[PDB]
Structures are given as C-alpha cells and as structure tokens.
Amino acid sequence: TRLGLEAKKEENLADWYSQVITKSEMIEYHDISGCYILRPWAYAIWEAIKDFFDAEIKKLGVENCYFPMFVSQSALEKEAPEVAWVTRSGKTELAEPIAIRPTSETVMYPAYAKWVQSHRDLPIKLNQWCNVVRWEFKHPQPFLRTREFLWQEGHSAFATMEEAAEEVLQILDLYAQVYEELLAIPVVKGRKTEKEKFAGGDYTTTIEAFISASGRAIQGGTSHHLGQNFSKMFEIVFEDPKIPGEKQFAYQNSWGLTTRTIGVMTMVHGDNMGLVLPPRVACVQVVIIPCGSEEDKEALIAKCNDYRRRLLSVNIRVRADLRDNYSPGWKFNHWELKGVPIRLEVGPRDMKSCQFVAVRRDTGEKLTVAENEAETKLQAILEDIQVTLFTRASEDLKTHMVVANTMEDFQKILDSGKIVQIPFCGEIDCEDWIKKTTARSMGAKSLCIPFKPLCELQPGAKCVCGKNPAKYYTLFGRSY
Ligand SMILES: O=C(NC1Cc2ccccc2C1)c1nccnc1NC(=O)N1CCCCC1
Ligand code: PRO
Ligand SMILES: [Cl-]
Ligand SMILES: [Zn+2]
Q1: Is 357 exposed, middle or buried (0-12, 13-18, 19+ CB in 10 A)?
Q2: Which of 258, 267, 441 to mutate to test the pocket of ligand 1 (most atoms within 8 A of CB)?
Q3: Domain limits at 284?
Q4: Among 158, 380, 386, 450, which lies 20 to 30 A Cα-Cα from 418?
C-alpha cells in the first residue's frame, strides 16, 4: 500500500483509473467479474445526479414507479445473448427459465396495453430508478462498462408522433444539462446511425462524450423514439377520436442515463493527483483542515467549527476533518485524492491574523482569504472551479474534433487521438468497412450524426467509401 497515486494518467491510463477510483474511496472490487461496489463517495455523486434529474422530469409530468426485475420468456419473444437467466431456486429447478431485465420495454408495455383504452388515457409517462443487467463477455471497466449498473429508464407513450418527437429532444437536453451543468463535461448531441440505433426503434438520439486521455468516445446517454414498433408488438392501441372504427397505435419513447456518468467525470477531470469533483456534484465542496499545545489545539477546533457553520449558512456543503490521529500533511494528500474542490486550511498564524488559505483543487492555487470575506469568496471560488473545469474540458473536445473528407486524412487524424466528422453515406456495409479499414476495437465506429455539424455537404459530395453519395456529416472515432 502506498500514499498517493503510482501511475501517471498519460503513461498507463488503465492503472491510473484503477488507482484513482480506489484511493478516492469510490470503487471497491467484487469477486464477480464486471461488477463493482459503489462506495459512498461514488454513490453521493449518483445521488446528486438523481436529485437533479428526478425533479426535472417530475416538472414535465413524468411519474416514478417500479416494475419487476424478472421478464418472462414469452414477453421477450414478443420483440438475447447478454440476458442473464435464472433457472433454479436453491436446489429445485424452475419450470422454465426467467430473465433478468437488461431493459424494461418488455416488462412495462404489456401493462401499458391494459392501461390504454381511449386516447384520454394518454400520455403515460413513467420512470424508474433501478438496476439492469447486461452480461456481456467483453472487457469490463468500472462505471463505464459494467455487467450490472444503476440507471433511470423513462418510458413514455403518446397518441401523436409530434408529442413523442418533442419529448425525445427535451429529455436529451436534460441529459446534456446533467453532463454540462452538473458534471462540467461537454457532449455532442446527435442521431445514431442505422447500425448503432436502438433495436426495434425508429431513431435514436444520443449525447457523445470524449475521453481525451485515451482518444476514445463513449455514449453518455440516449433517448429513443420507438415510434409504433413496440405498441404493435404489445397491442397498445386506442380508438381514434377523429375516425371511428379504425384503431391507432401509440407512439412511444424510452430514454436512459446510467452511473457511467461518474466514470466519465473521473476520466475527464481527474489528474495525476487523484479525483477532481465538480462543485455542483461534490457532496463535500469545502473541507476544513486545521494546520500548524492543548488549549491552542482547542482554539483551532473552535475556529474550524466557526467556518463550518458559516459555510452551511450560505448553503455550502462543508465538512471539517478534526481527527487527531492524522497529521495535516496526511489530510492534505487524503482530501486531494478524493477531489474536494476547496481545502480550507486554518493554522495558528492564519487564525490570529483573521486569515485562512483556500486551495483550489482544479488549479492548485493557494488563495489567502480574509475571515470577513469567507462566505462570498468561497462561493466565487466554487463557481470559478465549475466554470474552469467545463471550459478546459470544452476546449479539449473542440481541439480534438475535426473534419476529414478522405480515408487517408481520416486515418491520419484518427491515429493522433482525435474524433473525426466525415461525409458518410449512412449504409451499414460502409460503416463495417470503415471499422475494418481503420482497425488494421482499434477501429473507428460511428458515434453520432451531429445535430449541428461543423460543416455542410454540397451537391455531389461523395462518401469516404467513394461509391455512395454522402447523406450527412457523421462523427466517427474509437469508442469505449
Ligand atoms: O452499457 C453498459 N454496459 C454493457 C457494455 C459492456 C461492456 C463490457 C462488459 C459489460 C458490458 C455491459 C453500461 N455499463 C455501465 C454503465 N452504463 C452502461 N450503459 C450506458 O451508459 N448506456 C447509455 C444509456 C443507456 C444504456 C446504455
Ligand atoms: O436501454 C436503452 O437504451 C433504453 C433507454 C432506457 C430504457 N431502454
Ligand atoms: Cl432509489
Ligand atoms: Zn459510404
């Protein structure tokens, strides 16, 4: 066991990630491959995301619920290799296997069919916070790629396509708000290609995040328009209020956001000193550490409690580390590893001078702040830390996302650690050829068709394959 980190983020990113998530007390490993323990330091971030997102969807009329985890084989057949099957209880074998949900479309929609008789029963907007299981045999990674993960999943059903199309973008923007405003992570809004869209849906919208350390992208969240494909599978129908006799199928959406958010936060903002928490999601925004007798020792404790109560009065999540068995230097390293945005340091000389040293986690700057200006200055520093983290991550993404129009430039830019927007024909066969040619997975797959591309096509613009014309500028790159 060692004091600080041992692996540089730019040297061994895998070892760096494992050291950051464990020494920040976020992740503990489990004896089942692909499953990881969420320690309170990690789970508190998820609770911050949950508190924000849950209040926002309720403002939109979505209500919470809980559907069973187990799916009958019959329900799944209405619509495979990553689904986990329960086959016995104790020593007795079940009559037939039952599946653990990888997603709850086939669980809820049989119930949706019973609840919809007329168009007045629509819309139905439900969300549940729960766990799903996707038992893939690919290489797992904590937070990012796990066999079990926590998420929310929203499932809406409307009578018109126009209501559904509007919610898809509304939910997607809330997902962007979670990454941009809470996690200080920039994302690219876009549409998945036909190959990468949700199976059984019409179109899939997504937010793509970029990990600069690896040059790989990852899907931060998704919002599907299922159209009428699932309402035809489960007979979610209603009598047409404008045409008697004929029946209509409901238009549906589904949208999900997982704990992968936390791992992206770690990969983007974490440095060689450990984790870095955005002040918006840090359960401890300011940690007070006494610095520099037995009565003078009690003096530092009283002043640390005074700053603690004053910060609580201005709604600043503050905690004081008054433990007598750890030296100040140890606490400096400890709370630096955990990513607390501000380390409030109070010593004997600073206290007698009505001062204290505030250390920004993002930049390491030591700011000497007077006692009278404690509430206002610490709020300004917290605000500037959130802005700085987002601005640096934003310009990092902008400089690593460029445009290429030939496979030669595509490959050269891809090898420099960037993601590229290329003229793409949209076909699945060409997308497979792009991944195979760029692999020589090390190959590039499609990320999204950007809502706002960097440039536009022109009449006669050919795809990178050269055989089909280009339909849209599409973002490609190596992915998680
Ligand atoms: O897809 C995940 N895991 C599977 C891929 C993989 C790779 C290696 C080993 C096992 C597995 C299972 C995932 N894992 C953790 C957290 N979020 C995850 N998913 C998502 O964030 N998205 C976007 C939102 C809708 C759902 C999909
Ligand atoms: O798994 C998915 O991608 C969608 C979104 C949450 C529910 N089903
Ligand atoms: Cl919960
Ligand atoms: Zn093509």
Answers
A1: middle
A2: 258
A3: 279-383
A4: 386
